[PDB]
Design a binder for this molecule. Sequence first.
Ligand SMILES: Nc1nc2c(ncn2[C@@H]2O[C@H](COP(=O)(O)OP(=O)(O)NP(=O)(O)O)[C@@H](O)[C@H]2O)c(=O)[nH]1
Ligand code: MET
Lengths: 89, 415
Amino acid sequence: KVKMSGLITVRTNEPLGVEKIKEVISKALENIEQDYESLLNIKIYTIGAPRYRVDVVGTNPKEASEALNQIISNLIKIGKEENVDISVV
Amino acid sequence: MAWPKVQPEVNIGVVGHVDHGKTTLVQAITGIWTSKHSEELKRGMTIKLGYAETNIGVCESCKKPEAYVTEPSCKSCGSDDEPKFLRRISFIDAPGHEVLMATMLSGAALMDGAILVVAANEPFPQPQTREHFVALGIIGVKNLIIVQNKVDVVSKEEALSQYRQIKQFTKGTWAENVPIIPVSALHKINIDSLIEGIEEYIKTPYRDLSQKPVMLVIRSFDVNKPGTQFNELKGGVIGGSIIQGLFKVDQEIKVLPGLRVEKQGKVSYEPIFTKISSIRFGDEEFKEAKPGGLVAIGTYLDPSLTKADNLLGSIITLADAEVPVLWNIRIKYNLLERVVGAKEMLKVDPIRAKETLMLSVGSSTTLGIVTSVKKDEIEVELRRPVAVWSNNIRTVISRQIAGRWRMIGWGLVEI
RNA sequence: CGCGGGGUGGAGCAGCCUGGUAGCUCGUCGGGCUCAUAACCCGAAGAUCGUCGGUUCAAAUCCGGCCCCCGCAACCA
Ligand SMILES: Nc1nc2c(ncn2[C@@H]2O[C@H](COP(=O)(O)OP(=O)(O)NP(=O)(O)O)[C@@H](O)[C@H]2O)c(=O)[nH]1
Ligand code: MET
């Protein structure tokens, strides 16, 4: 039950990218939630800047970071595919 | 016997300086007492264009000059035989204030040949009164029929009083004869005088639709930021209000202009193009874009770019000469007999070398350099990127004194 | 889980991704012009970023609790 730092900077290049996110919502994003068990929700929320603090919430404390890291890795892998740079500074 | 029905087109609205007797005018003749009463509606925000069908009717026996009305027949001249109808028309309107003046133009959408209600109680100069004249006066409505409202009881000299300065104002200039009508909308006393003055209409013939216009966008809130969850993204639809004519469902193929994106010394504002998915008409949406208040047109936006009023002055035009920095500006001006600043009546300097003035095209105000003195024409360079469509236009022009601004007149660019 | 600009010297601010130099366009006393100066020559002037805890090698820059203003913002006597 521990909240985390979890603040990164993502970038996506194409104009259709705005919708392309929903395309790869219909394709890519699934099961990551149930990768583990007993969580609440998943969220991506801005720092009031192009930086977004994300969130993964569950009872198991440590796995937070683990899972947290995995979610970052998503865009990373997506970057290795879809030209998505999750890079902060 | 009369029951023909012919040509019920071209609706008419009423606007002016704040609380000049507009709402009471669009509602002026509607119901009787039971239910359906008073004025306006439950929501005072700009919305609900048409009042739909308005009864306008007269009798036979009772004489023409003093008689026209909504409520069935007349109990003043007596009741014998069925009354005669005039025509089927809505009543539109638009708000305006320091903030809301713009709505005037867009509120003139369903409003063709608006009827104008001037003041009585309030004096002639007001910010949005002359603002009303020098702005709206070019919109193409010469059908404005001046109606003095807001007068209850005084020493009765008030009537002809409100007639005087107006007699000095128009008719010696553009906008030929405009009927001026004394009334009190306040007490429902003396309305028949407003219809007996208004019945006239302006001369120029016009067409229905299918032309090359441009709408301007308007207010809307910036929908919940990601803070909850990345969810709640329909794209963050935001929408505007129309001024001139239209065609169909199709609205935004191009978002002109767009984001700075920095880039060294000279920064261009780069537009973003898309086809339309949404177009909100209200609590539920429409196919075309309806004017008035909050409307939401399909725009796909993470809650960043929408720039909730970070970048003000929403600007929309169509096409372009295509190059992100395009500056050549040739303007033939007019201005005014004398200069009009703040309350001051004293003259301000004429054309001098390399003076700087606000060249504001649309909802942008852009730095401009009046430079070359051509006599009554000037060349004025701009910084932030913008695209004019045609030679026909009204440039808004201001003056620089110590971080402050004063509008000094008008001119038009010729492409 | 619908509230939006803000307050980075006494007018407007792209300050809150680039963790610790600080003004573009204001107002002022002391010199001002062997021609009147709202066009300006010398930017002298004085540093609480409005309360706060924490984080702190320091806070102009953060999460929150406190906020006094304008709110549905362009052809503005
Ligand atoms: N200053 C002033 N206000 C008045 C007078 N008579 C009525 N009013 C006010 O007018 C208000 C109605 O405003 P409203 O109808 O919304 O304004 P409007 O007159 O339609 N014009 P607009 O709405 O476009 O500004 C009422 O609250 C009423 O008190 C008057 O003589 N002087
Ligand atoms: C206010 O100063 C006024 N003179 C401006 C327009 S003329 C009515």
